[PDB]
Coordinates of C-alpha atoms (C1' of nucleotides) and ligand atoms in Angstrom, one line a residue:
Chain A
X11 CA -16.7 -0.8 -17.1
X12 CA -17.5 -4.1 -15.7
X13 CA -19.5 -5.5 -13.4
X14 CA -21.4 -7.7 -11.1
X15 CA -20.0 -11.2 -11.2
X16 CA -16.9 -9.1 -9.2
X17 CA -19.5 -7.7 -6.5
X18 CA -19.5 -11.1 -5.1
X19 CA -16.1 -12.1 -5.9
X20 CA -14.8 -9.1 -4.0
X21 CA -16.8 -10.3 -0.7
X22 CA -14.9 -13.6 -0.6
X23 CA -11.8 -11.8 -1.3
X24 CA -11.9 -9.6 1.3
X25 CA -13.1 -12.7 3.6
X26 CA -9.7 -13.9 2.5
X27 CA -7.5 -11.1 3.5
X28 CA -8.8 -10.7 6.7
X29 CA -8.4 -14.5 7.6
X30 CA -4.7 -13.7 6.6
X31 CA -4.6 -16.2 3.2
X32 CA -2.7 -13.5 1.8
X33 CA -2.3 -15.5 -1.2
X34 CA -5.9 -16.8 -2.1
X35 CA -6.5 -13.1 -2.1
X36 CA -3.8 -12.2 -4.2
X37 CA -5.4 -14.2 -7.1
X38 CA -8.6 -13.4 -6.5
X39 CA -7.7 -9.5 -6.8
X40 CA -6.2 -10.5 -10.4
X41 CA -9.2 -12.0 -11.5
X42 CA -11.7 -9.7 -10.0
X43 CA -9.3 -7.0 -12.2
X44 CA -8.9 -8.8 -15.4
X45 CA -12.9 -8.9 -15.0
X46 CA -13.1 -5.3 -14.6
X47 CA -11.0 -4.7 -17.8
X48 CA -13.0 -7.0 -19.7
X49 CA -15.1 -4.8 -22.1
X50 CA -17.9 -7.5 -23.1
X51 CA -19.9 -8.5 -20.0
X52 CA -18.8 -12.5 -20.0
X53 CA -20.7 -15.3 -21.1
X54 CA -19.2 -18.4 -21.9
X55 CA -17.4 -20.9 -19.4
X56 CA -14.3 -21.2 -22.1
X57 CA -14.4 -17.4 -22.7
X58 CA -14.2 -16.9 -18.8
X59 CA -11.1 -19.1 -19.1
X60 CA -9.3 -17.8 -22.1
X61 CA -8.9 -14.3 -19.5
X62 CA -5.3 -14.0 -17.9
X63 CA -6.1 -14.7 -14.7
X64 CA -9.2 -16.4 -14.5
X65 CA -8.7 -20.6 -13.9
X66 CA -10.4 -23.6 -14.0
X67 CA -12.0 -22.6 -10.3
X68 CA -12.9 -18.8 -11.0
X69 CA -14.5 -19.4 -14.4
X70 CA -16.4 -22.2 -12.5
X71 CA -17.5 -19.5 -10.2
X72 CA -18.3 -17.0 -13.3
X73 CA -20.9 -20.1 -14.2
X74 CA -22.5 -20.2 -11.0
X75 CA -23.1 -16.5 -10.8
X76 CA -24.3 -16.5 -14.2
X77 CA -26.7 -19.2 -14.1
X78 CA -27.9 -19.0 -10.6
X79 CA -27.2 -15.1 -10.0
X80 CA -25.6 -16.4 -6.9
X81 CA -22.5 -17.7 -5.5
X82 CA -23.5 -20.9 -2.8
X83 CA -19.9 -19.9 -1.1
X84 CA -20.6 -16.4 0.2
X85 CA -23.4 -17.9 2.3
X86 CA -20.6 -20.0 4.3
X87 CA -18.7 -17.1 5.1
X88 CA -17.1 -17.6 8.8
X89 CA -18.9 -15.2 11.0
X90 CA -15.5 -13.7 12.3
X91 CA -14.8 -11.8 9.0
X92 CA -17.2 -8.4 9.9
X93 CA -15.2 -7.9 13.3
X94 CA -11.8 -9.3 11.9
X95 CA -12.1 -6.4 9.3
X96 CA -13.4 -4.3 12.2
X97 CA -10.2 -5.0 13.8
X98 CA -7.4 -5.1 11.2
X99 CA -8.8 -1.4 10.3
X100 CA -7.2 0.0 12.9
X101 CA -3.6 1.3 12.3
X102 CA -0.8 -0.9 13.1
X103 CA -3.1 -3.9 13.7
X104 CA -3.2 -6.5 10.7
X105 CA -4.6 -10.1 10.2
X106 CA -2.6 -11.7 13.1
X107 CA -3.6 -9.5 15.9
X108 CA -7.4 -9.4 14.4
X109 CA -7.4 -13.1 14.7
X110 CA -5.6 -13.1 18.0
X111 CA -8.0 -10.2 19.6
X112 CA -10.7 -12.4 17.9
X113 CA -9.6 -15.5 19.3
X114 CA -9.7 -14.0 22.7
X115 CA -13.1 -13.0 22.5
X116 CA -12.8 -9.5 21.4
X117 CA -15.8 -8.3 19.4
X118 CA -16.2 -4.9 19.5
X119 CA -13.8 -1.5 19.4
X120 CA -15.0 -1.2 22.8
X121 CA -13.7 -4.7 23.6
X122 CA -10.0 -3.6 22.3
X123 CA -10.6 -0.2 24.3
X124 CA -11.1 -1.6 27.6
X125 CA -9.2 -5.1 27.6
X126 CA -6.9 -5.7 24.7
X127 CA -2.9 -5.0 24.9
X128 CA -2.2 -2.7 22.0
X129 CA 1.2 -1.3 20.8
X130 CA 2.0 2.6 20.8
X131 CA 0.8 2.3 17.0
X132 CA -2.4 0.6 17.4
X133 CA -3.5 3.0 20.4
X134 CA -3.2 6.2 17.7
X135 CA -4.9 3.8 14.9
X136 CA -7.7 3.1 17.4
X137 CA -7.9 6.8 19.0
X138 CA -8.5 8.3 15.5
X139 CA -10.6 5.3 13.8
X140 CA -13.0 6.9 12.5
X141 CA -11.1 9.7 10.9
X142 CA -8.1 7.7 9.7
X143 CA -10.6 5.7 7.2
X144 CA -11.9 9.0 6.2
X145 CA -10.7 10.4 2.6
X146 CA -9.9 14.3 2.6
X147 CA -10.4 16.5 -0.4
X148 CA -7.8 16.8 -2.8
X149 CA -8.1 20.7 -1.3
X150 CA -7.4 19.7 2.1
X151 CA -4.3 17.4 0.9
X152 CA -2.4 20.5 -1.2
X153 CA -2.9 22.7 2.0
X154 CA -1.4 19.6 4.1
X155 CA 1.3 19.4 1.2
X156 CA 1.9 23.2 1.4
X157 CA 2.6 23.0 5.3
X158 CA 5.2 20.9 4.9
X159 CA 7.2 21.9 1.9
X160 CA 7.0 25.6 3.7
X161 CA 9.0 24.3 6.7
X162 CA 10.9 22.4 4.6
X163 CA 12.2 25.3 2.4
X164 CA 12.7 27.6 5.4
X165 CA 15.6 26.0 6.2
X166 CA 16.8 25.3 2.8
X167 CA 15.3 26.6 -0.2
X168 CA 16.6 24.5 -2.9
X169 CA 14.3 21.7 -1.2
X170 CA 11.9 20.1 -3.3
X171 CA 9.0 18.7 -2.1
X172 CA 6.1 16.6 -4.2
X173 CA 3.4 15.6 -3.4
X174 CA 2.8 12.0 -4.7
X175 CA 0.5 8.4 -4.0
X176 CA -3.6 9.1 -4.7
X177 CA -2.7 13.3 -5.1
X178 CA -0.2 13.1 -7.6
X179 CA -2.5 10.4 -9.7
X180 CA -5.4 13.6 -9.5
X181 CA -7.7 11.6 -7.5
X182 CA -10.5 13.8 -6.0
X183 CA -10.3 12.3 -2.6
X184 CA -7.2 11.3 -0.9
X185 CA -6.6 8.9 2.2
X186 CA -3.6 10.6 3.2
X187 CA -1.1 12.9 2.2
X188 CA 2.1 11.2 0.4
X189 CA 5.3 13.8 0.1
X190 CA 8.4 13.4 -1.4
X191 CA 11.3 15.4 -0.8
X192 CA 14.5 15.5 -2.2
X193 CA 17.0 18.6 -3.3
X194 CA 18.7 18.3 -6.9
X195 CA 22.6 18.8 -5.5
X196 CA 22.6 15.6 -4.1
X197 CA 23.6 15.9 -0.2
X198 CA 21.2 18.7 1.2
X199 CA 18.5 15.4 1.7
X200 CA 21.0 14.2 4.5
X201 CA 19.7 14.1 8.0
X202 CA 17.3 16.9 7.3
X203 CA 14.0 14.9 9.2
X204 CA 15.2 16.0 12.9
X205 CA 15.0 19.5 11.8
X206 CA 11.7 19.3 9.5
X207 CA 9.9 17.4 12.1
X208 CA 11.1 19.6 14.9
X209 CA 9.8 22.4 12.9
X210 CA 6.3 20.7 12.2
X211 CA 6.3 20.0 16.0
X212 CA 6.8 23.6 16.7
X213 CA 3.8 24.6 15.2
X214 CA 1.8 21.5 16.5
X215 CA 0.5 20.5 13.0
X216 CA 2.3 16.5 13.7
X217 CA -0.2 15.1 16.5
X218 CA 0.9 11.8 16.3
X219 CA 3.8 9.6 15.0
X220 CA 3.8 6.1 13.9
X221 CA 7.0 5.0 12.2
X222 CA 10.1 7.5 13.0
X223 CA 13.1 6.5 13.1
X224 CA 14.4 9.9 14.5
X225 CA 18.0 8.0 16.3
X226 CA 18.7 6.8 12.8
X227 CA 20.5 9.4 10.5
X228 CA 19.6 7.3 7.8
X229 CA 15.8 7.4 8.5
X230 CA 13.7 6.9 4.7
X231 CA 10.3 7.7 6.3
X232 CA 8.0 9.5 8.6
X233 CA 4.6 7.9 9.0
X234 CA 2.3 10.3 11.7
X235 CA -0.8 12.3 12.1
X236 CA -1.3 15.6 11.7
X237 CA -4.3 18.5 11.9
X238 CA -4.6 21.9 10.1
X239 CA -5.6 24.5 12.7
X240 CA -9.0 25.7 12.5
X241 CA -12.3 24.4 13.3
X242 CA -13.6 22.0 10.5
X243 CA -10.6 20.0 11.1
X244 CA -9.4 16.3 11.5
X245 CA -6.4 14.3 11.8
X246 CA -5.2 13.1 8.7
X247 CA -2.4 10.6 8.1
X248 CA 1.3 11.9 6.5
X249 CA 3.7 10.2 4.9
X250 CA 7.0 11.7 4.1
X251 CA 10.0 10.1 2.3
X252 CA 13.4 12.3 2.1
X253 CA 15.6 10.6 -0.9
X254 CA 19.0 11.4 -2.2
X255 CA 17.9 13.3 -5.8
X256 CA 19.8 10.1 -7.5
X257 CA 16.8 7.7 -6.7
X258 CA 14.3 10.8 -7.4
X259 CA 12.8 8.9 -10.6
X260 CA 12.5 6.1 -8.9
X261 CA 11.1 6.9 -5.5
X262 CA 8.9 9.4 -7.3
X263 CA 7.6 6.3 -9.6
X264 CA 6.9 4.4 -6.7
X265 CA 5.9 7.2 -4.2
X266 CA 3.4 7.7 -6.6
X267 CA 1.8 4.2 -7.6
X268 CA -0.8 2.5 -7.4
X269 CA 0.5 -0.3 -5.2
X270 CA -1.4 -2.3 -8.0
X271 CA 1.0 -0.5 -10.7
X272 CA 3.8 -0.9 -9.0
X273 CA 3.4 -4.5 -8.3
X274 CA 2.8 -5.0 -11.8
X275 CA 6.0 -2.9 -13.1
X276 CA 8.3 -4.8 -10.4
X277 CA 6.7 -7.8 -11.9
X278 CA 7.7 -6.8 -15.3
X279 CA 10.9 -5.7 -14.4
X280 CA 11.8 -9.4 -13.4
X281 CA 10.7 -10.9 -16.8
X282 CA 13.4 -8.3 -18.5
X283 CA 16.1 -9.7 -16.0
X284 CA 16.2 -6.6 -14.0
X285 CA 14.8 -5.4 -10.5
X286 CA 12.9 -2.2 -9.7
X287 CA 12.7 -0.7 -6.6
X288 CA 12.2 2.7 -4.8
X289 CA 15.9 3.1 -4.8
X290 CA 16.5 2.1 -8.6
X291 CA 16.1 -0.1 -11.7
X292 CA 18.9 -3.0 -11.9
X293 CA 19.7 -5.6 -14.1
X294 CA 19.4 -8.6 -11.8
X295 CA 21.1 -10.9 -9.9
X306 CA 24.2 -7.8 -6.8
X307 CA 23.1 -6.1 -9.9
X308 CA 24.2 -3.0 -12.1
X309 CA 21.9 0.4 -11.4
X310 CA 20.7 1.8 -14.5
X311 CA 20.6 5.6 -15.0
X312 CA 17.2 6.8 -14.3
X313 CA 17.2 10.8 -14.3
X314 CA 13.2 11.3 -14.8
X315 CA 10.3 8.3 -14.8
X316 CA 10.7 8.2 -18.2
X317 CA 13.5 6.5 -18.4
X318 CA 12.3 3.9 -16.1
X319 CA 9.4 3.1 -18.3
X320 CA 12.2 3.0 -21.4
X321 CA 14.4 1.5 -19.6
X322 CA 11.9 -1.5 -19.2
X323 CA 10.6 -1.3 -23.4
X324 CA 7.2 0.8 -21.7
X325 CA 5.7 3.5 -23.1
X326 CA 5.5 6.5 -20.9
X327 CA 2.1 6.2 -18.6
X328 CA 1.2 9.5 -17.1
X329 CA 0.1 9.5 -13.0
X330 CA -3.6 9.6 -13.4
X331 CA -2.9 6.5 -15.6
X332 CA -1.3 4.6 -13.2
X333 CA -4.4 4.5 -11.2
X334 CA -4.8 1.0 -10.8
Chain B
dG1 C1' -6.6 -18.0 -6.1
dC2 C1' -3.4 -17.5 -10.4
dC3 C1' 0.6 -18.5 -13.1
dG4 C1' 4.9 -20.8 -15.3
Chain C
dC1 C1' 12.8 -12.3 13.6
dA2 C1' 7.2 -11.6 12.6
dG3 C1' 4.1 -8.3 11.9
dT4 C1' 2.7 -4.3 9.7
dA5 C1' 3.4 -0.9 6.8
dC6 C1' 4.6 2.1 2.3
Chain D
dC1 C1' 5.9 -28.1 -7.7
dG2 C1' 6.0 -23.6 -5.7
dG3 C1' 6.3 -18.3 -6.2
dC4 C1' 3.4 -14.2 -6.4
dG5 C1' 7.2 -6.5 -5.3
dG6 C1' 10.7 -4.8 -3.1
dT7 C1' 11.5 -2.5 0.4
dA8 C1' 11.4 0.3 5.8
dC9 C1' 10.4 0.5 11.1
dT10 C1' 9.0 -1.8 15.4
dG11 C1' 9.8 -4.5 19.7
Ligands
DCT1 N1 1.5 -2.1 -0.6 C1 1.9 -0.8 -1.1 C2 1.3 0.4 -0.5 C3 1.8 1.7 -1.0 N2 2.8 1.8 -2.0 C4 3.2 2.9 -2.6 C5 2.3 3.3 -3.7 C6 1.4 4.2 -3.3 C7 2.3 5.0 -2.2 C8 1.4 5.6 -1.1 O1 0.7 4.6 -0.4 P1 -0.8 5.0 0.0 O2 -0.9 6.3 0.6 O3 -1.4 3.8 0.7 O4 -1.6 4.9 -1.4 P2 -2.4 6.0 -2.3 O5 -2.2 5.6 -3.7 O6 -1.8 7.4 -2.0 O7 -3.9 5.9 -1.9 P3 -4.6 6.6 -0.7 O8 -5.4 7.8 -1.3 O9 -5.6 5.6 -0.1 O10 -3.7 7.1 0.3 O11 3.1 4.2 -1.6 C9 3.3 0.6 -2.6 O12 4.2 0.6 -3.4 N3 2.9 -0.7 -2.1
MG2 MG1 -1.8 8.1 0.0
NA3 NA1 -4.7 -2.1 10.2
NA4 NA1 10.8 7.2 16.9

DNA sequence: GCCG
DNA sequence: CAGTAC
DNA sequence: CGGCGGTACTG
């Protein structure tokens, strides 16, 4: 739907992420989505006011841009914000180490090549820059998903592996590729990344790893890089979560998403005296687990009607 | 920034 | 822990 | 006045 009062709204948010007030952002994102959802292009100071989520200093805002067709604030944007989202797009680096490089002159990618300090993580981020804030075709991501549930089920069968984030909501484009695995008798899960990753090694499809706990028997996550062989080919990002099949409908839900949807169910969750996580639904507190067997019962659970994946696209 |  | 990440 | 989702690695 709507519109172009959030066009401008969305440059100072982003001017307020990557300056790190987290929180200024936070609200502006809620506004700049309640004005999205509003189906009648918004006229009236009271009306832009009446909206969940829109105050007394957004609605003033909505007037300006109405009036005017302008917003005075975007033209007093600091002049950091171009290279601190420059710098907080590489991997591993966020709005701290932006404002630190910034602060220490830094001003370019070549800058950060040739004299910043940058941890293990943030020398992958950097060395595949370009490609990492690339999005694949959905295509590409089922081949990528395919890879790894075939080296998964070579070693056990009963293995099941999904797909989930952007690819499981039947986007067209994905950023990365998001796959959960689990196995339904509830102890074949265990310790099972040593010999999956080893395998994915073997091959040399994983380039690159980020987050790996590998010493941990316990490990939730693998966060890397990998490449399909061929030529045409670039390195793409790979998550993969292994989960005892008790939290399946859980860490599925929130495998899955949005982030924006899952902040918003967790959100609910609290106003029902419970707590949702990728682990389970609990009443609050620690708390009593409910019985979730499929996602559906997570959205009963919380008095929800079922929402497919591509509806939970927010 | 928003909200309770 | 803070930072960054999902 | 003061929280905003809930959680998993890294060093
Ligand atoms: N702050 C976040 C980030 C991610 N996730 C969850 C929901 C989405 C899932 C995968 O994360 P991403 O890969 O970043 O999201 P995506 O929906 O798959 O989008 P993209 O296509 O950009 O990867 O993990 C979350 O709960 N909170
Ligand atoms: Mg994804
Ligand atoms: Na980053
Ligand atoms: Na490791």
């Amino acid at each position: 739907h709507n519109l172009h009062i959030t066009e401008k709204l969305e440059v100072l948010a982003k001017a307020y992420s990557v300056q790190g007030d987290k929180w200024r952002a936070l609200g502006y994102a809620k506004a700049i989505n309640a004005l999205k959802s509003f189906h009648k292009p918004v006229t009236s100071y009271q009306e832009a006011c009446s909206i969940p989520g829109i105050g007394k200093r957004m609605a003033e805002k909505i007037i300006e841009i109405l009036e005017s067709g302008h917003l005075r604030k975007l033209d007093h944007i600091s002049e950091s914000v171009p290279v601190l989202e420059l710098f907080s797009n590489i991997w591993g680096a966020g709005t701290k180490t932006a404002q630190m490089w910034y602060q220490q002159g830094f001003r370019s990618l070549e800058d950060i090549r040739s004299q910043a300090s940058l941890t293990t993580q943030q020398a992958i981020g950097l060395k595949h820059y370009s490609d990492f804030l690339e999005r694949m075709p959905r295509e590409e991501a089922t081949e990528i998903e395919q890879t790894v549930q075939k080296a998964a089920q070579a070693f056990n069968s009963g293995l099941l592996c999904v797909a989930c984030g952007s690819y499981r909501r039947g986007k067209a484009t994905c950023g990365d590729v998001d796959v959960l695995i689990t196995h339904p008798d509830g102890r074949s899960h265990r310790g099972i990344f040593s010999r999956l990753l080893d395998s994915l090694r073997q091959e040399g499809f994983l380039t690159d790893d980020l987050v790996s706990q590998e010493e941990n028997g316990q490990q939730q996550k693998y966060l890397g890089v990998c490449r399909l062989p061929g030529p045409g080919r670039r390195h793409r990002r790979l998550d993969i979560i292994v989960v005892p099949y008790s939290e399946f409908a859980c860490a599925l839900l929130y495998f899955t998403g949005s982030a924006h949807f899952n902040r918003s169910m967790r959100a609910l969750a609290k106003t029902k005296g419970m707590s949702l996580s990728e682990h389970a639904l609990s009443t609050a507190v620690p708390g009593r687990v409910l019985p979730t067997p499929t996602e559906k019962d997570v959205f009963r659970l919380l008095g929800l009607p079922y929402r497919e994946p591509a509806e939970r696209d927010w």
